[PDB]
Design a binder for this molecule. Structure first.
Ligand SMILES: NC(=O)C1=CN([C@@H]2O[C@H](COP(=O)(O)OP(=O)(O)OC[C@H]3O[C@@H](n4cnc5c(N)ncnc54)[C@H](OP(=O)(O)O)[C@@H]3O)[C@@H](O)[C@H]2O)C=CC1
Ligand SMILES: CN(Cc1cnc2nc(N)nc(N)c2n1)c1ccc(C(=O)N[C@@H](CCC(=O)O)C(=O)O)cc1
Ligand SMILES: [Ca+2]
Length: 162
């Protein structure tokens, strides 16, 4: 099955100028790693270029990058369509789609699960997560956490299934 995972600040904002528009929340990164470890991850080229080299390729995961153009990094698998991205995952229990905006828009109609981090921050953005709440998603997990010394905004992890 196909799953999307995303951090959304207020009004579904997920990015600004190819970066996330809040300071790093290490607890959200630890949630991301927990949920994506040992699964293939599919990402657009802008998202691959936004991950610091210190954690690239994402370890313990098969990294699959969408680009219409030839690949520029032999360390990961490059693919030129959605169908090619899915094929490279192989027969596994769950495929994780990790962004960005144009990638999420294409995969949301195919997904049976969403892993969302809701961040209590009103920030400016140029990229939003697609409208999902109107469809037939039901929440099956949620967990709120207050801001602390290592995370400067409060956040709420959520899993929804179709
Ligand atoms: N808050 C969060 O959880 C996350 C936020 N983000 C943010 O999202 C933003 C990036 O999103 P966005 O600009 O939409 O970019 P994406 O990461 O979705 O990358 C889009 C690129 O991927 C390639 N691509 C997408 N679809 C196809 C396709 N069907 N066939 C071939 N190639 C395809 C294209 O590359 P090419 O141009 O080479 O053809 C396209 O330009 C950034 O701000 C980033 O920080 C990203 C991930 C998570
Ligand atoms: C910019 N980017 C995309 C990104 C960031 N936060 C997200 N958060 C959520 N919830 N979902 C996403 N898809 C998401 N994507 C990144 C940036 C860094 C790392 C990264 O360093 N990740 C380590 C996390 C370990 C760590 O905390 O350093 C990993 O192994 O996953 C991942 C994604
Ligand atoms: Ca590296």
């Amino acid at each position: 099955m196909i799953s999307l995972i995303a951090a959304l600040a207020v009004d579904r904002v997920i990015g600004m100028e190819n970066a996330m528009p809040w300071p790093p929340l290490p607890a959200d990164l630890a949630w991301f790693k927990r949920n994506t470890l040992n699964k293939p991850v599919i990402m657009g080229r802008h998202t691959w270029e936004s991950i610091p080299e210190k954690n690239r390729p994402l370890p313990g995961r098969k990294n699959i990058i969408l680009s219409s153009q030839p690949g520029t990094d032999d360390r990961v698998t490059w693919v030129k369509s959605v169908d090619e991205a899915i094929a490279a995952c192989g027969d596994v229990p769950e495929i994780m789609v990790i962004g960005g905006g144009r990638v999420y828009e294409q995969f949301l109609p195919k997904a049976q699960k969403l892993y969302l981090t809701h961040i209590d921050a009103e920030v400016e953005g140029d990229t939003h997560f697609p409208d999902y709440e109107p469809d037939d998603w039901e929440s099956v997990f949620s967990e709120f956490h207050d801001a602390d010394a290592q995370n400067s905004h409060s956040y709420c992890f959520e899993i929804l299934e179709r």
